[PDB]
């Protein structure tokens, strides 16, 4: 059989060099990096190389932290529940601004925060699909503790004007968090450009394992731990390190940035190939702006066919993709022109076969 | 070279069958268990078998939850920060009772809670080393929201009278949490016997990977999420599942309980062998009760030699162990009588060589 994987915004295959690099930490280098003896200290260089990889990947400096967490869901909960205690309670700033596009980790967390009496402005998205920047200017009051906007959208692939929000954020002395989960490996990421205080990411969107991620915290910026016990990660996040995943996610980030050109000019080309080949059907609208998207995503709709129906069918022919109803097709560097040609065929055939019904 | 590993209360080697069982989830079964297509659904049986393994390991029933988390540090933070919102705030019960023996995850979390104005009673430990039970009877007031006592101590190996506390807890209508991290694989565990509402554990203490653990939540018992986004784990803990680690930790628990006899009557025998062979030196006190300990741990002290000094030396001869100052030696089923004989030698030689100094 030959299955075709087009659901990379949901998760990604672990790159072989990633699996390879973590292996020794699953086999004989199983010591606790906190231990003082050989088993512990032996793990130190490999963890250090991994972290360097992380910092170079997001252009973070020595004075900043990139804290290892168990996923972006953790990072997101941590940023919001931390500003809550640090700013909303202790400092009166009882308002957070965010978008309606944000991943449920941020939105649900907020929903809980307003449960406790925080006022949260959920920015609505325009006809362009995206968020303006001026929208956050206009919403930042002076109770405003944090603004959270995701770098790229998981559903549409749309890039948001981070930097702009970065600047409108610096100028107004407000805390700025970007959930950058769908941007690693997909476009260049730079916390310095973005004047981010906080950035989230998750490894399994750039070919490392599920079960690990990162929060960039800028120097001097405080954030009350979500995992108290303050032993690991400079006391910022307690719990025995996930050695294998740390090493692996490091390699993952490195390869992710080293493929940024390829993502740009190959996967993007394959995406365009698929997309415009798909636009030659009936009422095959693409959903949203088509210029400010990550290279790998396309979100198409179809005449009278539910997205859910088209996907179930595509599965039968061993093609994997998600909703977004419309149909989200998200590539990676592992896809091939052969596959998308195949996809074009299987897509169109499914399309007109599902519509036959009067 | 031949290193001897005696630091199992710090972390454990991943059992080979564990590494083996997770492998396919690092290679071609990398789908998101939430996806609706083949890549996702394919992972379902293996996750289900893993969870069954977890439930059978702690004698939890169908109506209870065993929620996957990223470690015991997460579980501990989750129980305490959840009762805070559910009971302390929303319901007036502003008091938590716990021990001074507890792992810093629980103690630090509490320290933060009293920072917000919770009254936390830290129970002191007796000359016996342990906690009475009557001590928690006497401390449970009516603002009392939760009592948290660890099943077994990481430092001394001492078992606490869970069940007794279970009963004193049922009777007084108080929420009962046991951190059981050092009890899995070491003695039988039973939430039913223990009348636990909450139980924490971490895989890397019973030969699975660092970076995963569990919280048992009893049916009908609520606990406000620590990871909001409510998609995975019945909305109780959001974040993409850590597929490989889940499968592995399942196998880990299974093998852990299947070795409970061996832990009892082999590793315990090896521990006794080491311990009484070590008691034949000078002022080689063992620290604490010696009857109510898990089979694998011994915590010995020495005349005038600092523990830290003895450990540094032991490392040079490739023997790994921790402090607890005194000296904690924690075995696993992977140790061998050959090793402990060797240890006896290397220990005594180090002892009298470090003391030579006038
Ligand atoms: C922007 C963003 N932020 C957070 C997450 C979740 O990360 P975790 O590693 O699961 O915690 C995701 C992943 N959303 C996937 C799976 S639910 C999708 O199908 O769109 C994301 O895209
Ligand atoms: C009772 C108990 N509770 C929690 C933990 C920490 O679990 P994590 O998986 O790191 O979150 C531990 C592990 N304490 C180790 C390493 S710090 C020791 O050397 O004693 C524990 O023993
Ligand atoms: Cl918190
Ligand atoms: Cl919480």
Curated annotation (Swiss-Prot), chains A, B:
Catalytic class of the enzyme: transferase
Keywords: 2Fe-2S, Cytoplasm, Iron, Iron-sulfur, Metal-binding, Pyridoxal phosphate, Transferase
Catalyzed chemical reaction(s): (sulfur carrier)-H + L-cysteine = (sulfur carrier)-SH + L-alanine
Recorded metabolic or biological pathway in which this protein acts: Cofactor biosynthesis; iron-sulfur cluster biosynthesis
Database matches in Pfam families: Aminotran_5
GO biological processes: [2Fe-2S] cluster assembly; cysteine metabolic process
Entry GO CC: cytoplasm
Localization annotation: Cytoplasm
Family in the record: Belongs to the class-V pyridoxal-phosphate-dependent aminotransferase family. NifS/IscS subfamily.
PANTHER family per record: CYSTEINE DESULFURASE, CYSTEINE DESULFURYLASE FAMILY MEMBER
Functional description taken from the UniProt entry: Master enzyme that delivers sulfur to a number of partners involved in Fe-S cluster assembly, tRNA modification or cofactor biosynthesis. Catalyzes the removal of elemental sulfur atoms from cysteine to produce alanine. Functions as a sulfur delivery protein for Fe-S cluster synthesis onto IscU, an Fe-S scaffold assembly protein, as well as other S acceptor proteins.
Quaternary structure and interacting proteins, as annotated: Homodimer. Forms a heterotetramer with IscU, interacts with other sulfur acceptors.
Identification of the protein by name: Cysteine desulfurase IscS
Gene: iscS
């Amino acid at each position: 059989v030959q299955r075709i994987y087009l659901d990379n915004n949901a998760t990604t295959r672990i790159d072989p060099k990633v699996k390879e690099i973590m292996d020794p930490f699953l086999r004989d280098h199983y010591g606790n990096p906190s231990s003082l003896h050989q088993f512990g200290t032996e793990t130190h260089p490999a963890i250090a190389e991994a972290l360097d990889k992380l910092y170079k990947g997001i252009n973070a400096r020595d004075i900043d932290d990139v804290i290892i967490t168990s996923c972006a869901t953790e990072s997101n909960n941590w940023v919001l529940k931390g500003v809550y205690f640090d700013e909303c309670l202790k400092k009166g700033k009882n308002h957070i601004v965010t978008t309606v596009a944000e991943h449920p980790a941020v939105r649900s967390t907020c929903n809980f925060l307003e449960s406790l009496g925080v006022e949260v402005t959920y920015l609505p998205i325009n006809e362009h699909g995206s968020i303006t920047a001026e929208q956050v200017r206009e919403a930042i009051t002076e109770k405003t503790a944090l603004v959270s906007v995701m770098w790229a959208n998981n559903e549409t692939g749309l890039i948001f004007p981070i930097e702009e929000i970065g600047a409108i954020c610096k100028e107004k002395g407000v805390l700025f968090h970007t959930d950058a989960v769908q941007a690693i490996g997909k476009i260049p990421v730079d916390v310095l450009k973005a004047n981010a205080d906080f950035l989230s990411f998750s490894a399994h969107k750039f070919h490392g394992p599920k079960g690990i991620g990162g929060l960039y915290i800028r120097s001097g910026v405080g954030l009350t731990p979500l995992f108290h016990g303050g032993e690991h990660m400079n006391g910022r996040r307690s719990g025995t390190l996930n050695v294998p995943y740390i090493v692996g996610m490091g390699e993952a980030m490195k390869l992710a940035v080293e493929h940024l050109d390829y993502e740009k000019e190959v996967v993007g080309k394959l995406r365009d190939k698929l997309e415009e080949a798909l636009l030659k059907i009936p009422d095959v609208m693409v959903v949203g702006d088509r210029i400010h998207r990550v290279p790998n995503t396309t979100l198409v709709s179809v005449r009278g066919i539910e997205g859910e129906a088209m996907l179930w069918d595509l599965n039968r022919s061993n093609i994997a993709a998600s909703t977004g109803t419309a149909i989200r097709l998200s590539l990676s560097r592992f896809n091939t022109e052969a596959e998308i040609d195949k996809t074009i065929e299987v897509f169109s055939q499914a399309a007109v076969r599902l519509r036959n019904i009067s």
